[PDB]
Tab-separated table of C-alpha atoms in Angstrom:
chain	number	residue	atom	x	y	z
A	1	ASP	CA	-2.306	139.002	137.886
A	2	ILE	CA	-4.376	136.076	136.606
A	3	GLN	CA	-4.372	133.292	139.207
A	4	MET	CA	-4.422	129.654	138.073
A	5	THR	CA	-5.719	126.961	140.438
A	6	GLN	CA	-5.176	123.288	139.603
A	7	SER	CA	-7.097	120.329	141.006
A	8	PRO	CA	-6.328	117.956	142.495
A	9	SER	CA	-2.936	118.713	144.048
A	10	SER	CA	-2.000	115.032	143.735
A	11	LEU	CA	-3.603	111.894	142.330
A	12	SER	CA	-2.988	108.224	143.125
A	13	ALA	CA	-3.978	106.138	140.106
A	14	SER	CA	-3.091	102.817	138.498
A	15	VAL	CA	-1.624	102.009	135.094
A	16	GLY	CA	-4.376	101.861	132.487
A	17	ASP	CA	-6.700	104.235	134.341
A	18	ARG	CA	-8.432	107.236	132.775
A	19	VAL	CA	-7.635	110.437	134.659
A	20	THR	CA	-8.880	114.011	134.288
A	21	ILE	CA	-7.224	117.025	135.925
A	22	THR	CA	-8.652	120.542	136.056
A	23	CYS	CA	-7.212	124.052	135.836
A	24	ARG	CA	-9.282	127.164	136.557
A	25	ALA	CA	-8.374	130.777	135.802
A	26	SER	CA	-9.419	133.752	137.916
A	27	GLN	CA	-10.538	135.555	134.726
A	28	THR	CA	-11.634	134.508	131.257
A	29	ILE	CA	-8.634	133.725	129.053
A	30	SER	CA	-10.325	132.271	125.938
A	31	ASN	CA	-8.242	129.198	124.927
A	32	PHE	CA	-4.926	130.814	125.952
A	33	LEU	CA	-3.721	127.892	128.052
A	34	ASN	CA	-0.780	125.490	127.895
A	35	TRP	CA	-0.385	122.102	129.568
A	36	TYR	CA	3.165	121.054	130.517
A	37	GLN	CA	4.446	117.727	131.851
A	38	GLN	CA	7.495	117.297	134.086
A	39	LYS	CA	9.109	114.185	135.629
A	40	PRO	CA	11.332	114.479	138.725
A	41	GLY	CA	14.850	115.617	137.929
A	42	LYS	CA	14.004	116.389	134.294
A	43	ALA	CA	13.144	119.452	132.244
A	44	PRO	CA	9.498	120.391	131.605
A	45	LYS	CA	7.858	119.576	128.286
A	46	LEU	CA	5.019	121.429	126.566
A	47	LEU	CA	2.294	118.848	125.965
A	48	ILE	CA	-0.681	120.950	124.837
A	49	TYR	CA	-0.866	124.445	123.330
A	50	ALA	CA	-3.991	126.593	122.880
A	51	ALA	CA	-5.871	124.436	125.424
A	52	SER	CA	-6.517	121.649	122.892
A	53	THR	CA	-3.719	121.213	120.315
A	54	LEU	CA	-1.237	118.421	121.036
A	55	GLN	CA	2.401	119.009	120.172
A	56	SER	CA	4.490	116.701	117.998
A	57	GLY	CA	5.333	113.333	119.524
A	58	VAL	CA	2.603	113.451	122.183
A	59	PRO	CA	0.392	110.332	122.006
A	60	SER	CA	-3.310	110.770	121.308
A	61	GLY	CA	-4.081	109.514	124.831
A	62	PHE	CA	-3.778	113.100	126.075
A	63	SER	CA	-6.717	115.407	125.371
A	64	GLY	CA	-7.138	119.066	126.328
A	65	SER	CA	-10.518	120.775	126.578
A	66	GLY	CA	-12.011	124.010	127.838
A	67	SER	CA	-12.565	127.649	126.912
A	68	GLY	CA	-12.960	130.670	129.160
A	69	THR	CA	-12.021	129.895	132.769
A	70	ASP	CA	-12.285	126.120	133.310
A	71	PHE	CA	-9.977	123.733	131.451
A	72	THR	CA	-9.278	120.013	131.684
A	73	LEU	CA	-6.600	117.562	130.593
A	74	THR	CA	-7.532	113.891	130.281
A	75	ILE	CA	-5.255	110.866	129.947
A	76	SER	CA	-7.233	108.013	128.413
A	77	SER	CA	-5.063	105.117	129.626
A	78	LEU	CA	-2.233	105.882	132.035
A	79	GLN	CA	1.136	104.401	131.082
A	80	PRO	CA	4.333	104.159	133.176
A	81	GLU	CA	5.735	107.181	131.311
A	82	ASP	CA	2.677	109.314	132.171
A	83	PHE	CA	3.178	109.351	135.961
A	84	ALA	CA	4.567	112.850	136.501
A	85	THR	CA	3.574	116.378	137.522
A	86	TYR	CA	1.316	118.374	135.198
A	87	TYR	CA	1.185	122.173	135.094
A	88	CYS	CA	-1.153	124.611	133.378
A	89	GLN	CA	-0.163	128.104	132.272
A	90	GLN	CA	-2.171	131.039	130.953
A	91	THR	CA	-0.798	132.947	127.953
A	92	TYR	CA	-3.576	135.550	127.835
A	93	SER	CA	-2.004	138.516	129.640
A	94	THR	CA	1.275	139.370	131.333
A	95	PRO	CA	2.470	138.051	133.603
A	96	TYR	CA	2.005	134.573	132.133
A	97	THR	CA	1.202	132.652	135.308
A	98	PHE	CA	1.514	128.953	136.126
A	99	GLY	CA	-0.727	126.695	138.120
A	100	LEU	CA	0.843	125.080	141.159
A	101	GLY	CA	0.675	121.642	139.566
A	102	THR	CA	-0.877	118.195	139.872
A	103	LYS	CA	1.386	115.293	140.835
A	104	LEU	CA	0.453	111.824	139.575
A	105	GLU	CA	1.701	108.877	141.632
A	106	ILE	CA	1.208	105.126	141.355
A	107	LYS	CA	-1.331	103.877	143.890
A	108	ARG	CA	-0.405	100.793	145.909
A	109	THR	CA	-1.046	99.118	149.251
A	110	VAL	CA	-0.147	100.759	152.547
A	111	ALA	CA	3.383	99.798	153.594
A	112	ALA	CA	4.856	100.401	157.029
A	113	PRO	CA	8.376	101.875	157.140
A	114	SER	CA	11.494	100.094	158.311
A	115	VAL	CA	13.013	102.490	160.853
A	116	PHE	CA	16.704	102.635	161.776
A	117	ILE	CA	18.636	104.989	164.054
A	118	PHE	CA	22.366	105.661	163.696
A	119	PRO	CA	24.504	107.676	166.157
A	120	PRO	CA	27.194	110.084	164.933
A	121	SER	CA	30.635	108.748	164.117
A	122	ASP	CA	33.621	109.737	166.238
A	123	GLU	CA	35.260	111.295	163.164
A	124	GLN	CA	32.389	113.762	162.776
A	125	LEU	CA	32.445	114.357	166.538
A	126	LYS	CA	36.105	115.365	166.228
A	127	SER	CA	34.886	118.216	163.995
A	128	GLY	CA	32.546	119.489	166.731
A	129	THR	CA	29.221	118.479	165.145
A	130	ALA	CA	26.978	115.473	165.788
A	131	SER	CA	24.425	114.107	163.313
A	132	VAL	CA	21.945	111.503	164.558
A	133	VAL	CA	20.319	109.803	161.566
A	134	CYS	CA	16.840	108.249	161.418
A	135	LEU	CA	16.028	106.302	158.245
A	136	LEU	CA	12.529	105.260	157.140
A	137	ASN	CA	12.728	102.705	154.335
A	138	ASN	CA	10.068	101.551	151.861
A	139	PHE	CA	6.772	102.975	153.081
A	140	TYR	CA	3.507	103.987	151.439
A	141	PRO	CA	1.922	106.473	151.399
A	142	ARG	CA	4.578	109.202	151.307
A	143	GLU	CA	3.113	111.142	154.250
A	144	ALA	CA	5.118	110.227	157.354
A	145	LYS	CA	6.061	112.109	160.513
A	146	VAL	CA	9.384	111.993	162.361
A	147	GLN	CA	9.748	113.563	165.819
A	148	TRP	CA	13.138	113.747	167.516
A	149	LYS	CA	13.271	113.361	171.301
A	150	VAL	CA	16.362	114.063	173.410
A	151	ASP	CA	16.122	112.953	177.053
A	152	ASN	CA	12.330	112.682	176.584
A	153	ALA	CA	12.090	116.302	175.394
A	154	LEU	CA	10.589	117.329	172.065
A	155	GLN	CA	13.024	118.784	169.533
A	156	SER	CA	12.201	121.211	166.739
A	157	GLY	CA	14.024	123.421	164.262
A	158	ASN	CA	17.240	121.383	164.567
A	159	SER	CA	16.510	118.602	162.051
A	160	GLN	CA	16.672	118.225	158.277
A	161	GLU	CA	14.523	115.855	156.227
A	162	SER	CA	15.050	114.438	152.740
A	163	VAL	CA	12.428	112.317	150.965
A	164	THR	CA	12.865	110.282	147.796
A	165	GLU	CA	10.551	110.189	144.816
A	166	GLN	CA	8.319	107.180	144.236
A	167	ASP	CA	10.713	104.277	143.783
A	168	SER	CA	10.629	102.501	140.427
A	169	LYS	CA	11.201	99.258	142.364
A	170	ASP	CA	8.123	98.949	144.587
A	171	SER	CA	6.294	102.318	144.317
A	172	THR	CA	7.274	103.109	147.918
A	173	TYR	CA	9.003	106.127	149.450
A	174	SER	CA	12.094	106.492	151.627
A	175	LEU	CA	13.044	109.251	154.035
A	176	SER	CA	16.002	110.428	156.101
A	177	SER	CA	15.835	112.753	159.109
A	178	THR	CA	19.130	114.081	160.462
A	179	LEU	CA	19.260	115.814	163.849
A	180	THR	CA	22.405	117.965	163.857
A	181	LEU	CA	23.757	119.364	167.128
A	182	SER	CA	26.986	120.679	168.584
A	183	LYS	CA	29.423	118.198	170.098
A	184	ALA	CA	28.979	119.960	173.448
A	185	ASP	CA	25.178	119.735	173.260
A	186	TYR	CA	25.313	116.108	172.104
A	187	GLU	CA	27.570	115.195	175.029
A	188	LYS	CA	25.275	117.084	177.422
A	189	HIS	CA	22.542	114.454	176.903
A	190	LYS	CA	22.068	110.688	176.895
A	191	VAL	CA	18.890	109.256	175.324
A	192	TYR	CA	18.306	110.059	171.640
A	193	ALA	CA	15.181	108.763	169.909
A	194	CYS	CA	13.213	109.250	166.715
A	195	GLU	CA	9.479	108.564	166.907
A	196	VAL	CA	7.844	107.688	163.589
A	197	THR	CA	4.128	107.879	162.936
A	198	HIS	CA	2.718	106.451	159.713
A	199	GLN	CA	-0.570	105.071	158.449
A	200	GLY	CA	0.942	101.576	158.260
A	201	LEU	CA	1.868	101.496	161.962
A	202	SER	CA	-0.714	100.644	164.618
A	203	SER	CA	1.164	102.911	167.051
A	204	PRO	CA	4.166	105.235	166.664
A	205	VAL	CA	7.460	103.341	166.516
A	206	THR	CA	10.360	104.781	168.520
A	207	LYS	CA	13.992	103.971	167.711
A	208	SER	CA	16.302	105.055	170.522
A	209	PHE	CA	19.864	104.750	171.756
A	210	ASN	CA	21.880	105.908	174.746
A	211	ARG	CA	24.898	108.037	173.881
A	212	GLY	CA	27.833	105.639	173.737
A	213	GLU	CA	26.189	102.780	171.860
A	214	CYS	CA	27.457	102.090	168.348
B	1	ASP	CA	13.359	119.615	116.223
B	2	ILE	CA	15.517	122.488	117.471
B	3	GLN	CA	17.951	121.274	120.133
B	4	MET	CA	18.533	123.637	123.062
B	5	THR	CA	21.780	123.040	124.967
B	6	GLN	CA	22.415	124.785	128.286
B	7	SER	CA	25.718	125.314	130.057
B	8	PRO	CA	26.845	124.675	132.624
B	9	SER	CA	24.708	121.761	133.804
B	10	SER	CA	25.493	122.803	137.390
B	11	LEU	CA	27.058	125.878	138.957
B	12	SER	CA	28.195	126.395	142.551
B	13	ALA	CA	28.110	129.976	143.825
B	14	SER	CA	27.557	132.087	146.938
B	15	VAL	CA	25.427	135.059	147.935
B	16	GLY	CA	26.748	138.174	146.217
B	17	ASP	CA	28.353	136.368	143.277
B	18	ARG	CA	27.701	137.386	139.675
B	19	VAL	CA	26.756	134.435	137.469
B	20	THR	CA	26.001	133.814	133.789
B	21	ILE	CA	24.169	130.893	132.158
B	22	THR	CA	24.372	130.061	128.442
B	23	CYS	CA	21.691	128.598	126.161
B	24	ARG	CA	22.378	127.628	122.548
B	25	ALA	CA	19.960	126.701	119.769
B	26	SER	CA	20.730	124.227	116.989
B	27	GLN	CA	19.486	126.830	114.470
B	28	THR	CA	18.624	130.526	114.357
B	29	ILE	CA	15.551	131.458	116.401
B	30	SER	CA	15.957	135.268	116.451
B	31	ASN	CA	14.862	136.325	119.984
B	32	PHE	CA	12.066	133.753	120.462
B	33	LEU	CA	13.568	132.512	123.719
B	34	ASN	CA	12.182	132.173	127.247
B	35	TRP	CA	13.985	131.792	130.578
B	36	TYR	CA	12.135	129.942	133.362
B	37	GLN	CA	13.165	129.488	136.995
B	38	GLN	CA	12.127	126.570	139.204
B	39	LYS	CA	12.913	125.479	142.757
B	40	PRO	CA	12.814	121.772	143.682
B	41	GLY	CA	9.309	120.539	144.422
B	42	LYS	CA	7.761	123.821	143.246
B	43	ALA	CA	6.054	125.062	140.104
B	44	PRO	CA	8.081	126.741	137.341
B	45	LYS	CA	8.078	130.509	136.896
B	46	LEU	CA	8.581	132.339	133.611
B	47	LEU	CA	11.257	134.967	134.271
B	48	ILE	CA	12.120	136.329	130.811
B	49	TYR	CA	10.488	136.229	127.385
B	50	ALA	CA	11.653	137.546	124.004
B	51	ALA	CA	15.213	136.785	125.212
B	52	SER	CA	15.573	140.131	127.023
B	53	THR	CA	12.122	141.218	128.281
B	54	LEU	CA	11.739	140.661	132.021
B	55	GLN	CA	8.355	139.522	133.287
B	56	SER	CA	6.311	141.611	135.708
B	57	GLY	CA	7.763	141.167	139.207
B	58	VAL	CA	11.278	139.906	138.412
B	59	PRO	CA	13.972	141.986	140.171
B	60	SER	CA	16.304	143.999	137.949
B	61	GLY	CA	19.201	141.685	138.869
B	62	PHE	CA	18.149	139.283	136.098
B	63	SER	CA	19.333	140.251	132.608
B	64	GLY	CA	18.637	138.352	129.383
B	65	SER	CA	20.504	138.859	126.127
B	66	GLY	CA	21.102	137.207	122.777
B	67	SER	CA	19.661	136.907	119.285
B	68	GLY	CA	20.002	134.060	116.811
B	69	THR	CA	21.600	130.976	118.371
B	70	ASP	CA	23.495	132.119	121.503
B	71	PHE	CA	21.691	133.484	124.568
B	72	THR	CA	22.780	134.392	128.092
B	73	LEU	CA	21.069	135.000	131.419
B	74	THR	CA	22.995	137.034	133.995
B	75	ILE	CA	22.367	137.458	137.724
B	76	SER	CA	24.287	140.375	139.231
B	77	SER	CA	24.180	139.740	142.998
B	78	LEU	CA	22.929	136.273	143.913
B	79	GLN	CA	20.283	136.268	146.640
B	80	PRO	CA	19.240	133.138	148.576
B	81	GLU	CA	15.939	133.038	146.663
B	82	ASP	CA	17.920	132.988	143.391
B	83	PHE	CA	19.408	129.509	143.892
B	84	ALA	CA	17.253	127.317	141.652
B	85	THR	CA	17.215	125.514	138.308
B	86	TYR	CA	16.943	127.703	135.206
B	87	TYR	CA	15.581	126.450	131.878
B	88	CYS	CA	15.601	128.022	128.434
B	89	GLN	CA	12.982	127.326	125.777
B	90	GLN	CA	12.744	128.292	122.110
B	91	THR	CA	9.364	129.651	121.007
B	92	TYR	CA	10.032	129.942	117.263
B	93	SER	CA	9.054	126.566	115.776
B	94	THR	CA	6.955	123.698	117.082
B	95	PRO	CA	7.747	121.715	119.048
B	96	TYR	CA	8.798	124.446	121.485
B	97	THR	CA	11.750	122.598	122.987
B	98	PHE	CA	13.319	123.145	126.409
B	99	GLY	CA	16.945	123.026	127.399
B	100	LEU	CA	18.081	120.421	129.897
B	101	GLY	CA	18.571	123.052	132.593
B	102	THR	CA	21.222	124.740	134.726
B	103	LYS	CA	21.153	123.932	138.450
B	104	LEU	CA	22.501	126.923	140.389
B	105	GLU	CA	23.509	125.483	143.771
B	106	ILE	CA	24.950	127.164	146.860
B	107	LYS	CA	28.510	126.662	148.107
B	108	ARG	CA	29.096	125.294	151.605
B	109	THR	CA	31.829	123.547	153.560
B	110	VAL	CA	32.933	120.001	152.793
B	111	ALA	CA	30.748	117.431	154.563
B	112	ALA	CA	31.671	113.748	154.620
B	113	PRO	CA	28.803	111.315	153.952
B	114	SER	CA	27.423	108.813	156.422
B	115	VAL	CA	27.307	105.398	154.743
B	116	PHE	CA	24.731	102.679	155.414
B	117	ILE	CA	24.328	99.281	153.735
B	118	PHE	CA	20.961	97.526	153.431
B	119	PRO	CA	20.474	93.988	152.072
B	120	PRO	CA	17.324	93.052	150.153
B	121	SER	CA	14.257	91.989	152.096
B	122	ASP	CA	12.764	88.527	151.657
B	123	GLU	CA	9.541	90.218	150.528
B	124	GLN	CA	11.633	91.769	147.746
B	125	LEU	CA	13.295	88.437	146.912
B	126	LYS	CA	9.820	87.177	145.954
B	127	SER	CA	10.237	89.266	142.778
B	128	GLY	CA	13.281	87.280	141.637
B	129	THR	CA	15.484	90.375	142.004
B	130	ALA	CA	17.817	91.335	144.862
B	131	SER	CA	18.545	95.050	145.301
B	132	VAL	CA	21.427	95.823	147.677
B	133	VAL	CA	21.332	99.493	148.685
B	134	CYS	CA	24.210	101.720	149.802
B	135	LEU	CA	23.028	105.073	151.171
B	136	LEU	CA	25.213	108.166	151.565
B	137	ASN	CA	23.654	110.819	153.784
B	138	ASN	CA	24.434	114.526	154.215
B	139	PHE	CA	27.493	115.156	152.047
B	140	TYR	CA	28.944	118.046	150.062
B	141	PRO	CA	29.968	118.319	147.312
B	142	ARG	CA	27.876	116.032	145.089
B	143	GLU	CA	30.980	114.391	143.574
B	144	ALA	CA	31.211	110.890	145.058
B	145	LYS	CA	32.183	107.374	144.001
B	146	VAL	CA	30.460	104.132	145.041
B	147	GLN	CA	32.224	100.899	144.060
B	148	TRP	CA	30.450	97.579	144.593
B	149	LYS	CA	32.351	94.454	145.655
B	150	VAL	CA	30.713	91.012	145.607
B	151	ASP	CA	33.125	88.497	147.169
B	152	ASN	CA	35.922	91.060	146.692
B	153	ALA	CA	35.161	91.219	142.951
B	154	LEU	CA	34.818	94.786	141.691
B	155	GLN	CA	31.483	95.064	139.896
B	156	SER	CA	30.397	97.165	136.925
B	157	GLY	CA	27.374	97.655	134.698
B	158	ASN	CA	24.714	96.575	137.216
B	159	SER	CA	24.647	99.437	139.750
B	160	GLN	CA	22.506	102.561	139.473
B	161	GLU	CA	22.629	105.793	141.448
B	162	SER	CA	20.050	108.400	142.430
B	163	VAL	CA	21.024	111.738	143.984
B	164	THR	CA	18.761	114.146	145.827
B	165	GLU	CA	18.681	117.854	145.058
B	166	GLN	CA	20.420	120.348	147.323
B	167	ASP	CA	18.762	120.509	150.736
B	168	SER	CA	17.281	123.923	151.503
B	169	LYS	CA	18.635	123.989	155.082
B	170	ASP	CA	22.076	122.346	155.321
B	171	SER	CA	22.818	122.531	151.551
B	172	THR	CA	23.948	118.890	151.563
B	173	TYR	CA	23.150	115.979	149.263
B	174	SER	CA	22.135	112.356	149.715
B	175	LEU	CA	22.697	109.455	147.335
B	176	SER	CA	21.439	105.905	146.854
B	177	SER	CA	23.476	103.271	145.008
B	178	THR	CA	21.491	100.137	144.150
B	179	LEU	CA	23.304	97.001	143.015
B	180	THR	CA	20.694	94.887	141.216
B	181	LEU	CA	21.386	91.151	140.995
B	182	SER	CA	19.195	88.182	140.251
B	183	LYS	CA	17.879	86.202	143.208
B	184	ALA	CA	19.923	83.129	142.264
B	185	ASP	CA	23.113	85.122	141.657
B	186	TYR	CA	22.482	86.868	144.981
B	187	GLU	CA	22.094	83.496	146.722
B	188	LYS	CA	25.275	82.326	144.942
B	189	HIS	CA	27.640	84.754	146.727
B	190	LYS	CA	28.587	85.778	150.257
B	191	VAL	CA	30.041	89.199	151.128
B	192	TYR	CA	28.539	92.387	149.683
B	193	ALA	CA	30.411	95.658	150.198
B	194	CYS	CA	30.167	99.242	148.991
B	195	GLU	CA	33.288	101.432	148.997
B	196	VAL	CA	32.643	105.181	149.165
B	197	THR	CA	35.158	107.780	147.996
B	198	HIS	CA	34.465	111.453	148.682
B	199	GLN	CA	36.388	114.699	149.088
B	200	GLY	CA	35.539	114.650	152.801
B	201	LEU	CA	37.031	111.170	153.283
B	202	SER	CA	40.810	110.778	153.372
B	203	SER	CA	40.374	106.995	153.198
B	204	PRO	CA	37.523	105.376	151.239
B	205	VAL	CA	34.982	103.993	153.700
B	206	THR	CA	33.699	100.455	153.136
B	207	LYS	CA	30.375	99.173	154.461
B	208	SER	CA	29.743	95.457	154.026
B	209	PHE	CA	27.514	92.589	155.080
B	210	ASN	CA	27.627	88.792	154.971
B	211	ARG	CA	24.487	86.807	154.139
């Protein structure tokens, strides 16, 4: 199958900037390439067909170029409605393969997270499961690490993480890490902590509690 | 433009279930219809073109049918890798419009949400806008209700909600409810509460703070 490689994987730019993203095919495909745009939680939209032709409604700020293997899409002046993920797709031979995408985010200053730890409620404990919650609020960039420690022992494979998209409020990100254990296991231990490392912190910040505090 | 309408918007199923998704066009498009599949945070994948022709590599469990305005995609025995969002797209007349999608989610046990309330930060108040956040963490199903109360006055028309997609491990959801007031109106009132109603909560849980 024809492999499509997009570059870069992500791009931090400001409103009004001129950006250019690239898509390379493993074989020559003439101008048989489409450019799609997709915002989080919304359906994709075909922006450019035949490598260069814009579809109806698309502003002239988007321009597609390239023939053969290397193709580019250029946004002349980024607008708030242009920050999204962009995909390329070859239509030359079956299977019609997609690139893995290029995500455009709004660049801003580094922001340290606000970290909070919350023990499980007694109601959930009465069901036999215990969920310790660690919240990281309003940080930039999106890359953060959360490490759960129980009685000063590293935990792994027992946590779930959810991360928000770039907030329309302040262009930050928020994250939740839930460590879920059995009631028996939870009661077998005392000190529960989440250690957060982020670019905005001089040293990793640990939020901890002894079992019993609420 | 040709409007593509998909149904249902969401569908809860389990491994081994047989499921069907419908896509309708506002006008006849013969068989110029594509079915794409896409998992959250991942690139889309074209599964079917020409309404019925499966793409190279798709298992035989996927079946496309239809010609004209009504089209269906059928999955015989749902596998874990089948739970995703499916889009249809007409390829007859420009612009080649997409449907709004069908999110095929997995069924799990009822999980009550954990509720947290966060007041705005002073660094946010320097924008003249106060955003009070109520977070619901790890719940199932998605159906939930968040009612805002400012000084025991039920609010409306100024709160927005954002829901995550189904988690790939615990199959739960998480929701944010932001009440957006002006800085002066925020400094004009006292108690701020969010009341959460969910299938996993016999009594609605209220989380509040007092400035």
